[PDB]
Amino acid sequence: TVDQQEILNRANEVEAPMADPPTDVPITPCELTAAKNAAQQLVLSADNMREYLAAGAKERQRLATSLRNAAKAYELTDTPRVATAGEPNFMDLKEAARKLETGDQGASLAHFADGWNTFNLTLQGDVKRFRGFDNWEGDAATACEASLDQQRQWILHMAKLSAAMAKQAQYVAQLHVWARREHPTYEDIVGLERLYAENPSARDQILPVYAEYQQRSEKVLTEYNNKAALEPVNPPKPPPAIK
Numbered sequence: 563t564v565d566q567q568e569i570l571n572r573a574n575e576v577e578a579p580m581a582d583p584p585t586d587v588p589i590t591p592c593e594l595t596a597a598k599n600a601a602q603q604l605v606l607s608a609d610n611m612r613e614y615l616a617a618g619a620k621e622r623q624r625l626a627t628s629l630r631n632a633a634k635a636y637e638l639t640d641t642p643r644v645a646t647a648g649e650p651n652f653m654d655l656k657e658a659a660r661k662l663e664t665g666d667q668g669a670s671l672a673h674f675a676d677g678w679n680t681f682n683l684t685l686q687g688d689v690k691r692f693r694g695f696d697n698w699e700g701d702a703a704t705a706c707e708a709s710l711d712q713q714r715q716w717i718l719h720m721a722k723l724s725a726a727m728a729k730q731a732q733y734v735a736q737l738h739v740w741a742r743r744e745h746p747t748y749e750d751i752v753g754l755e756r757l758y759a760e761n762p763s764a765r766d767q768i769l770p771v772y773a774e775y776q777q778r779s780e781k782v783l784t785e786y787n788n789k790a791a792l793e794p795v796n797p798p799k800p801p802p803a804i805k
Contacts (some may be wrong), residue, residue, distance in 0.1 A: 565687040565697035569633035576693045576710065577626035580619070581684045583612050583724075584677030587745035589729060591738040592665035594658075595647065596790040600734050603644045604674070609729050615720065618713070618800040625709060625803035642793040649782045656755075658779050659748040667742070668735035675735065678728035685803060686721040689714050709804040716800055727795045737789050738761070744777050745782045 588608075590601040617638060653661075692714035694707050754775065756769050 563697050563699040563703070564636045565695075566633050566636050568695060568698055572691075573626040573629040576617075576629070576668070577623050578691070580688050581681060582587075582675070583615060583681050586670070586674050586677050588617070588674040589627050589670040590665055591671060591735065592663070593661035594786060595651070596787045597665070597734070597738065599644045599646055600790040600792050601671075603792045603794065604671075604727070605733060606641050606644065607730075607792075608678075611720075611723065611727065611795060611797055614638060614797040614800065618688070618716065618720070619804050621800045622713060623711070628804050629706065632706070633750070638799055641743050643794045644792075646760060646787070646791045650780070651722050652780050652783065655746065655779055656748065658783060659745060659751055662741060662745055662782075663748055665672050668738050669673040671731045671735040675728040675731035678724050682721045682724040682728070685724070686718060689717060692717075701755075706804060713803075714800045716798070723795055723797055724767075730746060734790055734792070737761050741782050741786055744778065746778055751775065780802070 588601050588604045590598045692710040695703055754768075754772060758765055759774070761768070
């Protein structure tokens with residue numbers, strides 16, 4: 563069975579443009595190191611992701627141009643992992659609050675998460691391009707179905723990873739929000755410092771309040787280190803097309 567015209571149609575179909583990924587760069591929600599690294603981690607992950615998708619397109623162009631062969635006759639590497647200090651660094655109260663309160667507080671991450679999620683949803687419905695044939699059979703035809711089907715699966719993995727990377731982002735965004743809610747404010751630290759600095763006989767009982775302020779802080783910083791240490795997003799290579 564040879565439908566000549568069906569080959570040509572499906573070639574054009576397979577190498578027509580797909581969705582452009584987002585070009586938004588994430589920015590640290592604040593000045594704590596853990597936050598900064600998390601944002602670094604995500605620039606690598608996303609850069610690598612965008613590269614692998616450009617390679618995919620190149621490989622879909624080869625598959626297409628190879629289908630037209632048939633009709634007629636009838637560098638990439640892993641994502642780097644960013645280092646993460648094993649010990650927090652329990653800096654003095656006032657500075658922890660200063661660092662935590664300075665930055666966009668997650669707006670970039672949220673916008674980043676947003677755009678990668680939309681990519682995942684829009685990409686996972688452009689797969690009709692990789693379906694089987696109707697009027698083309700035998701070794702030649704069936705082999706090409708395997709090659710289309712391969713990249714169909716790759717696409718769905720890449721779409722899953724987009725969604726995974728976007729989850730990391732908004733997870734840190736809300737992790738930060740937790741941290742602000744839980745950490746003593748600059749204002750209140752200064753305020754408590756002032757209450758000490760003016761009620762001199764009371765200072766004996768002001769002490770264990772200030773102690774619990776430090777404990778509260780350590781607890782936050784510890785949990786920020788750990789939970790903000792993201793995994794790299796390591797896309798698998800686009801599979802070879804066909805000749």
